[PDB]
Amino acid sequence: LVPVYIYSPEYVSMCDSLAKIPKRASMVHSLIEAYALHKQMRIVKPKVASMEEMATFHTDAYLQHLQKVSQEGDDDHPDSIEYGLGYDCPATEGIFDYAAAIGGATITAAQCLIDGMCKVAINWSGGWHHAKKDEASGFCYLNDAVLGILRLRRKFERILYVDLDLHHGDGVEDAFSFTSKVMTVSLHKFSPGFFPGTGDVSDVGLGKGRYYSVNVPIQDGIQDEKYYQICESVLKEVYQAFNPKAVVLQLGADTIAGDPMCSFNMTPVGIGKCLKYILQWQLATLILGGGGYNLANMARCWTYLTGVILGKTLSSEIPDHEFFTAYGPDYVLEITPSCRPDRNEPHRIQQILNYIKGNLKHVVI
Ligand SMILES: CC(/C=C/C(=O)NO)=C\[C@@H](C)C(=O)c1ccc(N(C)C)cc1
Ligand SMILES: [K+]
Ligand SMILES: [K+]
Ligand SMILES: [Zn+2]
């Protein structure tokens, strides 16, 4: 009925403690609260993930290792080499607790979807799609997206994962690569030297999971209109061929114009239209956050997207709240595209969509 919003003051504090950008969860929640959107959702206190719950995807050796180097901040452990710790993913003190809360918040939201508590569950602090079963990658130590999907596997036999982050959700695609129960769809920037380096259109999975992985390689400077047409064409084809019963959606904000990544040229409006097309499926939807390195932009994006889920049209003027001064110099909710060219050739885009049409033919047949 009413969208579940995963939040507790203790959870946000935990998320700000070891965040990449300081006060990541604070700003996003403070702005949502400022628009009084929390009063129209069902606020649910997240439960910290147990060792067994994480073990549904991650190996035991890896989990024990995190717990050991997290209590003292041992960034010099001789077993860290095996698990990808920790140059890109530092072995900072209390990192396992940080991952436990966020991992447990996605599972909690998934549990609300199972028990029929709602049709939509939101966790903006979640959605780290890079982590592997026994390896940390790209700031991700625990793949909370996979943990969420595995929780939904208790009720749903057809789960669709849609990744709209700037980067390819490799950790999630790799997790369900050998299965047809979960189809992963990832729209991302794909160029040599760009992280994580995988996710070409020819990457369709392995074994019995072949053709159940879908990748859309996109180039720099793409804007709302062209992006949506790509997203609509893929999701329409996938919905018919896969027939999902539940949806997990990762909405990273590193695609938005004004992000330090400086790749895609998106505004929250474009992603909003993508979210609308998925919401009208009337399926149990698990909304996750993701990447983003422009704090105020992330807040503007995810706050607007929360308004989309609720159907509310938000005021263009940023209301006075705790972090109001961070929204200079215009102090508005809208985000304007930068003056950069679109390097996506209309023929290559159509050529990719045709591959996907060809690959999904195998699924439906
Ligand atoms: C891991 C990642 C994003 C993942 C993501 O967004 N997953 O969703 C990006 C890495 C490769 C990167 O490009 C980078 C660039 C600059 C930088 N500093 C200037 C500190 C730190 C990292
Ligand atoms: K993506
Ligand atoms: K798959
Ligand atoms: Zn990203």
Curated annotation (Swiss-Prot):
One of its GO terms (cellular component) is cytoplasm. It is an enzyme of class 3 (hydrolase). A divalent metal cation binds at D165, H167, D254. The active site is at H130. It catalyses: N(6)-acetyl-L-lysyl-[histone] + H2O = L-lysyl-[histone] + acetate; N(6)-acetyl-L-lysyl-[protein] + H2O = L-lysyl-[protein] + acetate; N(6)-(2E)-butenoyl-L-lysyl-[protein] + H2O = (2E)-2-butenoate + L-lysyl-[protein]. Changing H130A: Loss of catalytic activity. Changing S26E: Decreases the deacetylase activity. Its EC number is 3.5.1.98, 3.5.1.-. Residues 1-311 are annotated as: Histone deacetylase. Changing D88N: Almost complete loss of catalytical activity. Changing D88L: Complete loss of catalytical activity. Its activity is inhibited by trichostatin A (TSA), suberoylanilide hydroxamic acid (SAHA), 3-(1-methyl-4-phenylacetyl-1H-2-pyrrolyl)-N-hydroxy-2-propenamide (APHA), 4-dimethylamino-N-(6-hydroxycarbamoyethyl)benzamide-N-hydroxy-7-(4-dimethylaminobenzoyl)aminoheptanamide (MS-344), 5-(4-methyl-benzoylamino)-biphenyl-3,4'-dicarboxylic acid 3-dimethylamide 4'-hydroxyamide (CRA-A) and butyrate. GO terms for biological process: chromatin organization; heterochromatin formation; mitotic sister chromatid cohesion; negative regulation of protein ubiquitination; negative regulation of transcription by RNA polymerase II; regulation of protein stability; regulation of telomere maintenance. Pfam families: Hist_deacetyl. GO terms for molecular function: DNA-binding transcription factor binding; histone deacetylase activity; histone deacetylase activity, hydrolytic mechanism; histone decrotonylase activity; Hsp70 protein binding; Hsp90 protein binding; metal ion binding; protein lysine deacetylase activity. Binds 1 divalent metal cation per subunit. Its cofactor is a divalent metal cation. Phosphorylated by PKA on serine 39. Phosphorylation reduces deacetylase activity observed preferentially on histones H3 and H4. Gene3D superfamilies: Histone deacetylase domain (3.40.800.20). Its main location: nucleus. Belongs to the histone deacetylase family. HD type 1 subfamily. It is linked to Cornelia de Lange syndrome 5: A form of Cornelia de Lange syndrome, a clinically heterogeneous developmental disorder associated with malformations affecting multiple systems. It is characterized by facial dysmorphisms, abnormal hands and feet, growth delay, cognitive retardation, hirsutism, gastroesophageal dysfunction and cardiac, ophthalmologic and genitourinary anomalies. This is Histone deacetylase 8.
